[PDB]
């Protein structure tokens, strides 16, 4: 079925194509340096290059050729990072949504589904891009001073006199029943099922790892309980950055005359989110219900895990797969698509949802699920020069990367017996301190060095 044929795009070695506005060259460097250190093979291009350009058609042609060439060489990009607002990378109007979308950068030349996990670091200045990057680096390197906020979430079924009880509450209650609960490590599941909502957004300030709102939205607000872009700019969650998901209308409409909610929540300095998932056009109650919970969910009936297909919540908590921000969105879209395929009540085509939902901020982040675990490994005392590979001990499934000065030299995934064969695409031929990074979904990163 669609889940088998069009599942999680994540693969190793991780490869990322980056297309960035030329103004961002300096500000982007620390993000690129870290992505290389953690094992991403990067192909980085700026819109001031003739082969890229600043116009939709050239950027799209450039990306599609990179993807096709990569695939032919058994090295397809996994991620596509768009760096800039619509003044430098425009997107285009959805065929179904009639609103801006980045989908066609990733759907190569004739395909329904994206070929790459695409996200947009939308910034109007280098300073704003730095704001996003610094939050991402704190989160991914786990350098936050107090990790207790990771064990807390905020879940809101927002106001609608009729739909809140029919769909909003069932959505949030499903998430809490199966995942966002004490038995998964969450000490504080702040949840608002209906009015009174007073106090709900103060939890963004005191600290949560995740905020999910489902009900009405506008380009610059979660409508009720109200959270506007003005309020975002006044948040105080220093060192406590979250993933936010707005299952509502138009909060990710990133070509609006004013910065949209999704842009502001990621752009704000030392507060707000490291990433946002939301919709560029309108969203709808049925389709968002399926997106979060899975297909077969019914209005006014509490859905079960056994009675629904895989939705975004379900995918998030699979340990093995769907471990990136982009993959959470993908899972949601798949569920809405499946719901249509098997004949659930839908009044819009699945094409619309793939055009609608976007990641703003860094979609390549692997979110923690409550408190992340401590990894186990052994660091060798030295690396002999001129080797095609090294054997590095790390827990099964861990991804090990060897680098120096932001140049990635080799990567490998630890097998079931706790040994990674790190394939050296660039061999070590000079003395120096080499960086070794080991990452794994819901584990604290290991960031060390080995002297050669
Ligand atoms: C516009 C909006 O935010 C809501 C979101 C509902 C889904 C919440 N998960 N859309 S709507 O269904 O209320 C809607 C209202 C009017 C029009 C013209 C389109 C959609
Ligand atoms: K309504
Ligand atoms: Na489900
Ligand atoms: Na997962
Ligand atoms: Pb914008």
Swiss-Prot record:
Listed binding positions for Ca(2+) 1 are 85, 254, 263
Domain of life of the source: Bacteria
Binding residue positions for Ca(2+) 2: 109, 111, 113, 115
Coiled-coil residue spans: none
Residues in the active site? 216, 249
Location within or outside the cell: Secreted
Q: What is this protein called?
A: Lys-gingipain catalytic subunit
Q: Which organism is it from?
A: Porphyromonas gingivalis
What is the name of the gene encoding this protein? kgp
The portion of the full protein included here is 229 to 680 of 1732
């Amino acid at each position: 079925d669609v889940y088998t044929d069009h599942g999680d795009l994540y693969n190793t070695p991780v490869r990322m194509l980056v297309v960035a506005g030329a103004k961002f060259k300096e500000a982007l460097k620390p993000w690129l340096t870290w992505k290389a250190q953690k094992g991403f093979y990067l192909d980085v291009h700026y819109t001031d290059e003739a082969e890229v350009g600043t116009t939709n058609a050239s950027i799209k042609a450039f990306i599609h050729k990179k993807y096709n060439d990569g695939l032919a060489a058994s090295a397809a990009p996994v991620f596509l990072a768009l760096v800039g607002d619509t003044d430098v990378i425009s997107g285009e109007k959805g065929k179904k949504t009639k609103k801006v979308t980045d989908l066609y950068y990733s759907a190569v030349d004739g395909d329904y589904f994206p070929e790459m996990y695409t996200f947009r670091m939308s910034a109007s200045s280098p300073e704003e891009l730095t704001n996003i990057i610094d939050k991402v680096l704190m989160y991914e390197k786990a350098t936050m001073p107090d990790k207790s906020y990771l064990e807390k979430v905020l879940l809101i079924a927002g106001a609608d006199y009729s739909w809140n009880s029919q769909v909003g509450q069932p959505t949030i209650k499903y998430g809490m029943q199966y995942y966002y609960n004490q038995e998964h490590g969450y000490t504080d599941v702040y949840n608002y099922l209906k009015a009174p909502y007073t106090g709900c957004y103060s939890h963004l300030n005191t600290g949560v790892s995740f905020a999910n709102y489902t009900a009405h939205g506008s380009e610059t607000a979660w409508a009720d309980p109200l959270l506007t872009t003005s309020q975002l700019k006044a948040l105080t969650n220093k060192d406590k950055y979250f993933l936010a998901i707005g299952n509502c209308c138009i909060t990710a409409q990133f070509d609006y005359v004013q910065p949209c909610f999704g842009e502001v929540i990621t752009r704000v300095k030392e507060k707000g989110a490291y990433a946002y998932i939301g919709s560029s056009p309108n969203s709808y109650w049925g389709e968002d219900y399926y997106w979060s919970v899975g297909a077969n969910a019914v209005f006014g009936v509490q859905p079960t895990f056994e009675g629904t297909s895989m939705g975004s919540y379900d995918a998030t908590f699979l340990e093995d797969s769907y471990n990136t921000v982009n993959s959470i969105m993908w899972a949601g879209n798949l569920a809405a698509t499946h719901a249509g395929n098997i004949g659930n009540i839908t009044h819009i085509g699945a094409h619309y949802y793939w055009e609608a939902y976007h990641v703003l901020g860094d979609g390549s982040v692997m979110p923690y699920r409550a408190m992340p675990k401590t990894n186990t490994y052994t660091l060798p005392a030295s690396l002999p020069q001129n080797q095609a590979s090294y054997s590095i001990q790390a827990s099964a499934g861990s991804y090990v990367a060897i680098s120096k000065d932001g140049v990635l030299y080799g990567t490998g995934v630890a097998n079931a017996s706790g040994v990674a064969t790190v394939s050296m695409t660039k061999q070590i031929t000079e003395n120096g301190n080499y960086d070794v990074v080991i990452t794994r979904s819901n584990y604290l990163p290991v960031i060390k060095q080995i002297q050669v």
